[PDB]
Design an enzyme around this catalytic site. Structure first.
Site, PDB file in Angstrom:
ATOM      1  N   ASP A 282       0.941  -1.277   0.030  1.00 51.56           N
ATOM      2  CA  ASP A 282      -0.159   0.136  -0.129  1.00 51.56           C
ATOM      3  C   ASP A 282       0.908   1.132  -0.152  1.00 51.56           C
ATOM      4  O   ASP A 282       2.045   1.312   0.235  1.00 51.56           O
ATOM      5  CB  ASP A 282      -0.732   0.178   1.296  1.00 51.56           C
ATOM      6  CG  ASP A 282      -2.034   0.925   1.254  1.00 51.56           C
ATOM      7  OD1 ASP A 282      -2.788   0.966   2.106  1.00 51.56           O
ATOM      8  OD2 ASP A 282      -2.253   1.406   0.146  1.00 51.56           O
ATOM      9  N   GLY A 283       0.419   2.256  -0.555  1.00 51.79           N
ATOM     10  CA  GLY A 283       0.941   3.621  -0.382  1.00 51.79           C
ATOM     11  C   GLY A 283       0.261   4.846   0.245  1.00 51.79           C
ATOM     12  O   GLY A 283      -1.080   4.447   0.027  1.00 51.79           O
TER      13      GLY A 283
ATOM     14  N   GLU B 172       2.495   3.792  -4.435  1.00 50.13           N
ATOM     15  CA  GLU B 172       1.823   2.591  -4.669  1.00 50.13           C
ATOM     16  C   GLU B 172       2.753   1.892  -5.467  1.00 50.13           C
ATOM     17  O   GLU B 172       3.095   0.631  -5.334  1.00 50.13           O
ATOM     18  CB  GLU B 172       0.370   2.693  -5.105  1.00 50.13           C
ATOM     19  CG  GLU B 172      -0.414   3.605  -4.028  1.00 50.13           C
ATOM     20  CD  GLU B 172      -1.849   3.644  -4.534  1.00 50.13           C
ATOM     21  OE1 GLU B 172      -2.124   3.963  -5.757  1.00 50.13           O
ATOM     22  OE2 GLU B 172      -2.841   3.609  -3.791  1.00 50.13           O
TER      23      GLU B 172
ATOM     24  N   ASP C  70      -4.693  -2.956  -3.149  1.00 44.72           N
ATOM     25  CA  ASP C  70      -5.860  -2.339  -3.316  1.00 44.72           C
ATOM     26  C   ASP C  70      -5.907  -1.029  -4.247  1.00 44.72           C
ATOM     27  O   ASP C  70      -6.831  -0.217  -4.068  1.00 44.72           O
ATOM     28  CB  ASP C  70      -6.567  -1.881  -2.055  1.00 44.72           C
ATOM     29  CG  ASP C  70      -5.998  -0.716  -1.400  1.00 44.72           C
ATOM     30  OD1 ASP C  70      -4.918  -0.256  -1.647  1.00 44.72           O
ATOM     31  OD2 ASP C  70      -6.676  -0.114  -0.273  1.00 44.72           O
TER      32      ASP C  70
ATOM     33  N   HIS D 248     -11.511  -2.014   2.276  1.00 47.85           N
ATOM     34  CA  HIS D 248     -12.145  -2.304   3.530  1.00 47.85           C
ATOM     35  C   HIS D 248     -12.387  -3.709   3.577  1.00 47.85           C
ATOM     36  O   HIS D 248     -13.026  -4.269   4.884  1.00 47.85           O
ATOM     37  CB  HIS D 248     -13.452  -1.669   3.365  1.00 47.85           C
ATOM     38  CG  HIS D 248     -14.685  -2.287   2.655  1.00 47.85           C
ATOM     39  ND1 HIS D 248     -14.317  -2.371   1.043  1.00 47.85           N
ATOM     40  CD2 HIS D 248     -15.599  -3.227   2.875  1.00 47.85           C
ATOM     41  CE1 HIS D 248     -15.215  -3.059   0.516  1.00 47.85           C
ATOM     42  NE2 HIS D 248     -16.053  -3.708   1.489  1.00 47.85           N
TER      43      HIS D 248
ATOM     44  N   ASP E 134      -0.891  -0.510   5.286  1.00 51.12           N
ATOM     45  CA  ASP E 134      -1.736   0.786   5.269  1.00 51.12           C
ATOM     46  C   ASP E 134      -1.204   1.513   6.449  1.00 51.12           C
ATOM     47  O   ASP E 134      -0.899   2.663   6.288  1.00 51.12           O
ATOM     48  CB  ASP E 134      -3.127   0.463   5.295  1.00 51.12           C
ATOM     49  CG  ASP E 134      -3.976   1.822   5.944  1.00 51.12           C
ATOM     50  OD1 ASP E 134      -3.741   2.895   5.311  1.00 51.12           O
ATOM     51  OD2 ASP E 134      -4.935   1.561   6.702  1.00 51.12           O
TER      52      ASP E 134
END
Length: 155
Positions: free
Chosen positions: A10-11, A48, A70, A124, A134
């Site tokens: 994640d970024g 990302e 994501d 989510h 995250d």
């Protein structure tokens, strides 16, 4: 041991541009590595891309890899952009270099060492590994220590 390398990314960045960071988890040869760094002035999308670059470049031989992220930006690039970019020599229709060409080319180079499988998760409905990325990304964004030297305001 897992018979397939696993990577999760994640970024994070608020501000375009602004202080940003990434997290990446790599399961590789019985080891679980965690990568994370923050950058003083960057974008969400460049973070990302960087996450995946760093985790892939950690691989020291040809592998079967499953990449879980994501990012809609990474998903679009992979599934919609890169093929047509390659054919046009990494330019858009107006014959300018594509945005983040530096990082896309570097990611592409790494992708091209491995048998690659993508898992496009939602934010989510992420796995424990994605949630932790995250966390790492937002914590890195808070404490930046690197320069995103490839970043340009004009594309």
């Amino acid at each position: 041991m897992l018979k397939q390398v696993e990577i999760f990314t994640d970024g994070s960045c608020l501000g375009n541009p602004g202080p940003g960071g990434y997290g990446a988890i790599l399961r590789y040869r019985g080891r679980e590595k965690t990568f994370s760094a923050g950058y003083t002035r960057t974008t969400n999308n460049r973070m990302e891309l960087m996450a995946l670059i760093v985790a892939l470049e950690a691989l020291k031989e040809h592998c079967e890899v499953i990449l879980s992220t994501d990012s809609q930006y990474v998903r679009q690039g992979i599934t919609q952009w890169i093929h047509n970019w390659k054919k046009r020599g990494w330019k858009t229709a107006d014959k300018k270099p594509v945005k983040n060409v530096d990082l896309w080319q570097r990611l592409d180079a790494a992708l091209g060492q491995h048998q690659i499988k993508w898992e496009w998760v939602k934010g989510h409905a992420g796995h424990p590994e994605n949630e932790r990325c995250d966390e790492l990304a937002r914590a890195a964004a808070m404490n930046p220590t690197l320069e995103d030297t490839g970043y340009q305001v004009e594309v």
